[PDB]
């Protein structure tokens, strides 16, 4: 996303309903995992390099 | 079935009458996976073959099944020139299933409001011969009668 | 026999036949049945011309019914229209009044589809 936008996300005050979570890697507003604070593309990205602790691709 | 000869699904025999051809029938009454409902229907039907008729309901069943077993049918085949309609004999396995199918379909068409009463009469009528499910069996054999001309194109 | 307006139900059940009255059903029905202490499982065919007037007098008097009821709902909407309000426009134009989506099927409130070219 844009800069003024990736900022305003963090300026959280004024009517706490407005705070929306955002990716702390991207700026990406959509599909941001509460847990990691990452967006879905970055979670796939970091998890692949191993840089996500105890996070391994599953199967069954 | 490109590689295989496609082996036959083999059924666990009935609990009460102790019979495969029943369970195989039971299945065909089963709508959306409820086996309970199916036998609790079929069984409630044999109840109806009883107080109503003085026979022994399994024995009728084996009969109504044999009465509804189509002896020959007509399958399509593709030849030089047009696509045809050729008479051939039904396999043992097939008459089995064909019979089983028609019984239920015809049965469910009879107007009677409860279900088990429909299988009751249809299994009765079929056995006694006048069944609407037998009408179908005949109508098929006739088709293979009328096409006896094309009887030399069979495999 | 007949309850408010004309509205004669019959045979069936008493609790069921009561639904056939406009303004009434299910809840409002099983309500007036123990409020007149009348058996609901019974059939309107037979019952004491007493518990018939018991049963009529209650309902007709308790809450408002088919004649004056419909007349009220008519008047609510007239009010909602012509006041100029947005609920009222979607009554005026025959389009769905509470949210929903008109890009595709509104059909119940829109009538049957009337097609055109591309």
């Amino acid at each position: 996303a844009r800069k003024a936008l990736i900022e305003k996300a963090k300026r959280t005050p004024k009517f706490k309903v407005r705070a929306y979570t955002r990716c702390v890697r991207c700026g990406r507003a959509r599909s941001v995992y509460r847990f990691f604070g990452l967006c879905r593309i970055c979670l796939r990205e970091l998890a692949h390099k191993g840089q996500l602790p105890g996070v391994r691709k599953a199967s069954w | 079935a490109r590689r295989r000869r496609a082996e036959v699904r083999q059924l666990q025999p009935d609990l009460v009458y102790g019979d495969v051809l029943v369970t195989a029938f039971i299945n065909k009454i089963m709508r959306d996976g409820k086996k309970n409902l199916a036998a609790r229907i079929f069984y409630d039907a044999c109840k109806i073959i009883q107080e109503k008729t003085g026979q022994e309901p399994l024995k009728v069943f084996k009969q109504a099944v044999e009465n509804v077993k189509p002896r020959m049918e007509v399958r399509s085949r593709r030849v030089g020139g047009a696509n045809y309609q050729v008479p051939m004999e039904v396999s043992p396995r097939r008459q089995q299933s064909l019979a089983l199918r028609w019984l239920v379909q015809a049965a469910n068409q009879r107007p009677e409001r409860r279900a088990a009463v429909r299988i009751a009469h249809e299994l009765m009528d079929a056995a006694e011969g006048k069944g609407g499910a037998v009408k179908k069996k005949e109508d098929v054999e006739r088709m293979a009668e009328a096409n006896r001309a094309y009887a030399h194109y069979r495999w | 026999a007949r309850i408010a307006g004309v509205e004669i139900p019959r045979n069936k059940r008493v609790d069921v036949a009561l639904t056939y009255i406009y303004g009434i059903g299910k809840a409002r029905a099983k309500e007036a049945l123990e409020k007149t202490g009348i058996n609901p499982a019974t059939r309107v065919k037979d019952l004491t011309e007493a518990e018939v007037v018991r049963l009529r007098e209650y309902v007709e008097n308790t809450w408002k019914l088919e004649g004056e009821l419909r007349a009220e709902v008519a008047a609510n909407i007239k009010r909602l229209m012509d006041i100029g309000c947005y609920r009222g426009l979607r009554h005026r134009r025959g389009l769905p009044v509470r949210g929903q989506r008109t890009r595709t099927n509104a059909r119940t409130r829109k009538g049957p589809r009337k097609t055109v070219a591309a």
Partner: protein, 81 residues
């Protein structure tokens, strides 16, 4: 709905309550369509905003519980062909 509630923005609620006891009543533009209307709003002319422009709306007693944005619609239509 609300109930322990009945929310009305106080921007205009001032100028409304004020135009009751001032002695004067005249034309007031607001952006608050989220608010509810009346009782002391009645007789008063209010200009709501649809996203496009401020729209005059005359206020009467049967407009009571209704939000202000009801009488100022947000779109333009006039049919298709």
């Amino acid at each position: 709905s609300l109930k322990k509630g009945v929310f009305v923005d106080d921007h205009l609620l001032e100028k409304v309550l004020e135009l009751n006891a001032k002695g004067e009543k005249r034309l007031i533009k607001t952006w608050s369509r989220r608010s509810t209307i009346v009782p002391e709003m009645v007789g008063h002319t209010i200009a709501v905003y649809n996203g496009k422009q401020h729209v005059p709306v005359y206020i009467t007693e049967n407009m009571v519980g209704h939000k202000l944005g009801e009488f100022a619609p947000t779109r333009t239509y006039r049919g298709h062909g």
